[PDB]
Design an enzyme around this catalytic site. Structure first.
Site, PDB file in Angstrom:
ATOM      1  N   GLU B  22       0.399  34.988  62.005  1.00 33.48           N
ATOM      2  CA  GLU B  22       1.708  35.440  61.514  1.00 33.48           C
ATOM      3  C   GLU B  22       2.735  35.243  62.620  1.00 33.48           C
ATOM      4  OE1 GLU B  22       0.866  39.575  59.864  1.00 33.48           O
ATOM      5  OE2 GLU B  22       1.776  38.637  58.089  1.00 33.48           O
ATOM      6  N   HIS B  48      -2.294  23.998  68.012  1.00 34.32           N
ATOM      7  CA  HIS B  48      -1.420  23.893  66.822  1.00 34.32           C
ATOM      8  C   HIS B  48      -1.707  25.001  65.757  1.00 34.32           C
ATOM      9  CE1 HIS B  48      -4.646  21.179  65.170  1.00 34.32           C
ATOM     10  NE2 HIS B  48      -4.393  21.893  64.073  1.00 34.32           N
ATOM     11  N   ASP B  78      -4.593  20.042  72.992  1.00 40.92           N
ATOM     12  CA  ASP B  78      -4.584  20.866  71.765  1.00 40.92           C
ATOM     13  C   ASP B  78      -5.741  21.914  71.753  1.00 40.92           C
ATOM     14  OD1 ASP B  78      -3.670  21.812  69.242  1.00 40.92           O
ATOM     15  OD2 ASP B  78      -4.060  19.936  68.171  1.00 40.92           O
ATOM     16  N   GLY B 151      -7.001  23.492  57.438  1.00 40.10           N
ATOM     17  CA  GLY B 151      -7.623  24.799  57.626  1.00 40.10           C
ATOM     18  C   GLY B 151      -8.908  24.740  58.432  1.00 40.10           C
ATOM     19  N   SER B 153      -9.071  23.057  61.362  1.00 41.31           N
ATOM     20  CA  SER B 153      -8.644  23.019  62.767  1.00 41.31           C
ATOM     21  C   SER B 153      -9.134  24.206  63.582  1.00 41.31           C
ATOM     22  CB  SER B 153      -7.131  22.984  62.867  1.00 41.31           C
ATOM     23  OG  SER B 153      -6.600  21.773  62.383  1.00 41.31           O
ATOM     24  N   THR B 169     -10.078  18.902  64.982  1.00 44.80           N
ATOM     25  CA  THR B 169      -8.664  18.966  65.344  1.00 44.80           C
ATOM     26  C   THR B 169      -7.708  18.233  64.393  1.00 44.80           C
ATOM     27  OG1 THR B 169      -9.390  19.106  67.596  1.00 44.80           O
ATOM     28  CG2 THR B 169      -7.102  18.415  67.295  1.00 44.80           C
ATOM     29  N   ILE B 171      -7.154  14.691  61.310  1.00 37.87           N
ATOM     30  CA  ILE B 171      -7.719  13.737  60.345  1.00 37.87           C
ATOM     31  C   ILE B 171      -6.733  12.562  60.085  1.00 37.87           C
ATOM     32  CG2 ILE B 171      -9.130  15.584  59.214  1.00 37.87           C
ATOM     33  CD1 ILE B 171      -7.194  15.328  56.717  1.00 37.87           C
ATOM     34  N   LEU B 172      -7.261  11.432  59.588  1.00 35.38           N
ATOM     35  CA  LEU B 172      -6.480  10.310  59.073  1.00 35.38           C
ATOM     36  C   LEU B 172      -6.596  10.420  57.583  1.00 35.38           C
ATOM     37  CD1 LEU B 172      -6.483   6.909  60.906  1.00 35.38           C
ATOM     38  CD2 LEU B 172      -5.113   8.972  61.341  1.00 35.38           C
ATOM     39  N   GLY B 209      -4.629   9.052  91.244  1.00 42.66           N
ATOM     40  CA  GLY B 209      -3.566   8.438  92.029  1.00 42.66           C
ATOM     41  C   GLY B 209      -3.593   6.943  91.796  1.00 42.66           C
TER      42      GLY B 209
END
Lengths: 300, 300, 300
Positions: B22, B48, B78, B151, B153, B169, B171-172, B209
């Site tokens: 929320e 996310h 993420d 949902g 994720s 995490t 999808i396509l 580096g």
């Protein structure tokens, strides 16, 4: 020698049929069905498949076509029973105990998606006792990731022994196609409703005589209980089987016939599927103390 | 006697949770999480899922609800880490070595698609080390054909032992639903980042580096080399761990800690997710001759 | 110790390639391919992948790039054959007998969906001998629930031994994304067509010299027959192999080379894919009596 579903699919696929429907403006519908009784020609399907039907035909995977008559249907649970006119050399399905199912069990969906002809798809039992999807009036769905698409309706959900574990009925799909969230009416529910339709041509709706809400973690915390799923009884109707059995307001129904309830919605669908006069065993919690109560179902 | 995923899912499903959020006009979001530490109530999720949250609640598969506080997060990879407020009788997940994964391994995705409740889906590992999808700042994704939808994720990607192999995490999906192209942050990356958040409340970004491009078949053909994937070094920053170790412009980084690199993007994501001060072994190639170089990581 | 597809995919994945195409305003297209002959560098693919190509390149899963030239193609069946220019250290695929396939057999799709890089997806053989989809001129498709998306076409459908069982070609998808209804050209059809292109640079279309319709349950009921799938012969062209063998109008072709036919469309595609001059055995039914007729194929 190579692992395959072919040895059991071979024997069982002839039991799953294609259901062709014609009716009211003229229209042509297509779904699937399952032969539940080879001798009588009894086919299980969905009510939403035969809903506006004037003419019903069944097609076997060998090409044989038969006419079918609607024996009965249930709008609330979405189960319809058909009878093949002049059945001959039919294969029937074995029905498994869907209450013995578990998340992870392998499942094979057999139906007619997009009117292509008999199609078998494989997946797992993703979830059980699924309700509140606002798909049906009575829901106690098996969830599966086996590809289920339009035309899969009324078809078979099978286990690895080729036994019926459910009737493929609905899907959750953003764009009208399978995303791996499919729902099946469990075999025990479909078998019981089918028996009511072979016996009476209609269902006989059972009731406990209980009014309640969903049991929550909040009620459980307030009363120091170790269960948070089930039915919270607020009212016991006088003269009902539940009043006679000694069910009291404030009780928490935890079980039905020894099996734990994951919701009040599950209890509601299991009781309405059960015939009036049937005796059920209710697992209860009264002031944090367990009780078992036998209730005779009334009519709704 | 019948094969099933149920015996392993029975033990491991309590560890995978539903994450309710929320925040701010007010919004209600839903995702998943994994209990990584039962004693402390540490829950891994996606950044996310938690991004704009003011209130975070966790729900267990038994129905128990808990409040949660954000311990820390990483925008680039993420990953977010939560702590359950007043944890009690929690089940934690075992974490597998994601570097030991191979294409064709079996995977079980566990989460909350479309807020249905705990859903288990099945597939194989489709691909590994997936980058350049412009989803995240740092990508080294496991690709799976297990049905993953909105949902899911922050949920679990498990092996057949019920061990964590990734955190679902992205999808396509052309039409917002699963087409069997799902991505998970690997468990090794998620575990390391989670440790940095329990230890510092923030991540510690490491660097070699090095400045470079993707190794190609074109560079390989030009210099008669038998490797075409990895990092082509164009610059070595002076005073860096790579300078001190003897890394030289024109080198081709082929491996990281004995594991072959499929891209420079993989190297970039693996190095950034490693803590500054950590020593790494670099599989290198100068003038077509192999070399191994130990580099101490700097801070970014 | 854990069951996996990784041991067999490890040996076989190198045989499945990515097909990159450049043509005409300039465009860049992407599909997949299968190495059918490692020595000659013969790659099987889909005509629709190569259709407008001016430049064709192949990419191996190790990163090696090769140029390719079109050897030949068939518009009607959607098969194209390419030759890698200066092939070196290539892996070829073993080809299985697709006529020995059964619904329930496990299948692995290997391709390049959405140009991500090599991807493996798993499923079952959903159906066989699929026609009338108006996708191709000649169809005898294997149907699979393995996730097949845009970019998978021209790629491999494999069994659990990593042998080619089909060439992923088309899908049924309401919104352009996999719903688990995928179609492959069977390996026997693909192998035969590929041989005709290596031998003649073009295909050789065979014909029976028959005109007919689909056999139905309606024809079967009218003539008290126990078969309802096949070809109903309405006309036998004079001077054709069918005329010379005694095929008469009103015959019902039930089998081809001892294998039952599920349709006239299957018969059509199997005959047109067979080289003219080849003798075929026709399972026939005249006046309800079985006959076997050997027919020499003409040219179309």
């Amino acid at each position: 020698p190579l692992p395959s579903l072919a040895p059991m699919l071979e024997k069982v696929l002839p039991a799953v049929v294609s259901v062709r429907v014609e009716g009211t403006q003229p229209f042509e519908g297509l779904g699937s069905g399952v032969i539940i009784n080879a001798s009588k020609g009894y086919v299980l399907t969905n009510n939403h498949v035969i809903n506006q039907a004037q003419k019903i035909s069944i097609q076997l995977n060998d090409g044989r076509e038969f006419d079918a008559k609607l024996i009965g249907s249930d709008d609330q649970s979405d189960i319809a029973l058909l009878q093949i006119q002049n059945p001959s050399k039919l294969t029937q399905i074995a029905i498994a105990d869907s209450d013995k199912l578990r998340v992870g069990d392998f499942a094979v969906a057999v139906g007619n998606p997009f009117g292509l002809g008999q199609t078998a798809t494989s997946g797992i039992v993703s979830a059980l006792g699924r309700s509140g999807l606002n798909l049906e009036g009575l829901e106690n769905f098996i969830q599966t990731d086996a590809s289920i698409n339009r035309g899969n309706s009324g078809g078979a959900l099978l286990n690895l022994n080729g036994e019926l574990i459910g009737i493929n009925t609905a899907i959750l799909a953003p764009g009208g196609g399978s995303v791996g969230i499919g729902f099946a009416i469990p075999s025990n529910m479909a078998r019981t409703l089918a028996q009511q339709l072979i016996d009476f041509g209609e269902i006989k709706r059972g009731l406990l005589g209980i009014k309640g809400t969903e049991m929550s973690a909040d009620i459980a915390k307030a009363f120091n209980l170790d269960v948070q799923r089930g039915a919270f009884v607020s009212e016991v109707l006088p003269g009902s089987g539940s009043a006679k059995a000694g069910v009291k307001a404030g009780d928490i129904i935890t079980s039905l016939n020894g099996k734990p309830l994951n919701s009040f919605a599950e209890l509601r669908s299991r009781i309405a599927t059960t015939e009036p006069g049937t005796k059920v065993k209710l697992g209860l919690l009264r002031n944090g103390k367990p009780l078992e109560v036998e209730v005779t179902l009334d009519t709704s």
